[PDB]
Amino acid sequence: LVHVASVEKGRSYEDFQKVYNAIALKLREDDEYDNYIGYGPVLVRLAWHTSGTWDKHDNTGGSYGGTYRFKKEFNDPSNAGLQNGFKFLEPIHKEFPWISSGDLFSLGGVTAVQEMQGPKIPWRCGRVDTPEDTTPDNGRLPDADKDADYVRTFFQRLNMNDREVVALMGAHALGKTHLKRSGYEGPWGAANNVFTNEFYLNLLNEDWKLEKNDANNEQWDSKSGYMMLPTXYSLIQDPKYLSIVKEYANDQDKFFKDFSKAFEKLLENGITFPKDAPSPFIFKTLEEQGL
Ligand code: HEM
């Protein structure tokens, strides 16, 4: 199918800035979640998993239809824990019932990145909810126990090249793995709820050991108490990925710019924006608005 963006009737930038603000205010208020990491990371992951089901070959999946609201997708084992992000967004949707589910899930991720001091991420409205039978089957999100060739091939399905992959993976500065959710345990760094290039610095600078965690899975652990998934560590095992890791470890602005482009692309894959659609919105943070 073709999925044509359709602006929620009569809405404009100010309407979406209000939704942004409500997400951002709740992010600030609900500070205790996940041992005081807060909801930013899980909202970024929800935006990525609701977009990352896309298949360029036939335009199935993707952010357009908001299909995570259906049980097949929210019960995907790959999505274990994202219910927390959905629950966070439920009072936002109740207050703003006119936004589509795909617009809300993707906007949650943009708002989280920006409020965590990340780059501005331009965002377009107009995803339209689609019916339950359009929900993609489970198994389209990536495995963590694989190598660089797996990662490279996986992301071709999402039309991402090596630079886009390495940039997107820098979101693992955020949050942590949780053993009961994914079979992996630990944070990738210390600044768990501030968006920086720390993922790359930790890859290069920590001393990593290949260990088994208490779910009997291998992961790479540092004495600082950080971890990398096998797929994260593959970015320094593959020589093409390694060069880009070093680039982003040495240039915060370049990582921000590249992440912003790749994340917007991820959130817009599958969507056709009419020629006379609004331009992408760049929302002000609460801090910029003095809120
Ligand atoms: C090869 C690709 C990737 C794999 C295998 C992978 C795998 C994982 C795994 C296993 C977890 C832990 C879930 C848990 O136990 O809570 C996780 C968390 C996370 N992922 Fe990734 N991921 C990948 C790419 C991405 C990308 C592209 C983004 C977004 C741009 C992303 C954002 C995050 C975030 C923010 C978290 C933390 C969630 C929290 O703290 O609740 N990941 N990922």
Side-chain angles (χ1 to χ4, degrees), residues 72-97:
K72 177 167 71 171
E73 184 169 345
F74 56 77
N75 284 330
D76 183 352
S78 302
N79 286 339
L82 291 181
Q83 299 96 331
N84 289 285
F86 188 84
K87 155 174 190 242
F88 176 97
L89 290 172
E90 271 182 7
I92 309 299
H93 215 169
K94 187 178 188 275
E95 184 172 3
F96 306 97

Side-chain angles (χ1 to χ4, degrees), residues 13 17 20-21 107 109-124 195 252-265 267-268 280-289:
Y13 178 72
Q17 179 79 71
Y20 178 104
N21 286 357
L107 183 54
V110 164
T111 304
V113 170
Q114 296 194 174
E115 289 301 301
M116 294 189 288
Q117 303 168 236
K120 305 288 201 305
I121 319 299
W123 175 89
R124 301 185 85 162
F195 195 97
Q252 296 182 100
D253 182 61
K254 182 65 164 183
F255 168 54
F256 270 31
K257 285 177 65 170
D258 283 359
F259 182 87
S260 177
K261 285 176 6 257
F263 196 62
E264 179 175 13
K265 176 177 165 176
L267 269 42
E268 292 176 358
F281 301 140
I282 301 165
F283 296 115
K284 300 183 154 347
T285 60
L286 294 177
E287 177 184 52
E288 279 171 336
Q289 295 170 86

Side-chain angles (χ1 to χ4, degrees), residues 45-64:
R45 197 187 200 222
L46 177 64
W48 140 237
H49 276 205
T50 51
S51 304
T53 60
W54 187 56
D55 186 339
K56 70 183 179 179
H57 296 103
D58 55 11
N59 201 21
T60 52
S63 72
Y64 184 85

Side-chain angles (χ1 to χ4, degrees), residues 26 79 104 114 141 168:
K26 191 178 172 69
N79 286 339
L104 184 60
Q114 296 194 174
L141 297 161
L168 288 169

Side-chain angles (χ1 to χ4, degrees), residues 33-34 37-38 40-46 48-49 78 80-82 141-145 150-151 154-155 165 167-185 188 192 229 231-232 259 263 266:
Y33 169 72
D34 203 2
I37 296 173
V42 76
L43 291 174
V44 176
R45 197 187 200 222
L46 177 64
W48 140 237
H49 276 205
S78 302
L82 291 181
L141 297 161
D143 296 334
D145 63 340
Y150 170 82
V151 171
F154 173 88
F155 273 104
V165 167
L168 288 169
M169 215 78 67
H172 282 174
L174 302 174
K176 61 187 293 291
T177 65
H178 308 77
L179 201 74
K180 292 303 113 96
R181 289 177 185 177
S182 63
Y184 294 98
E185 175 63 40
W188 294 268
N192 310 139
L229 299 165
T231 43
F259 182 87
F263 196 62
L266 178 75

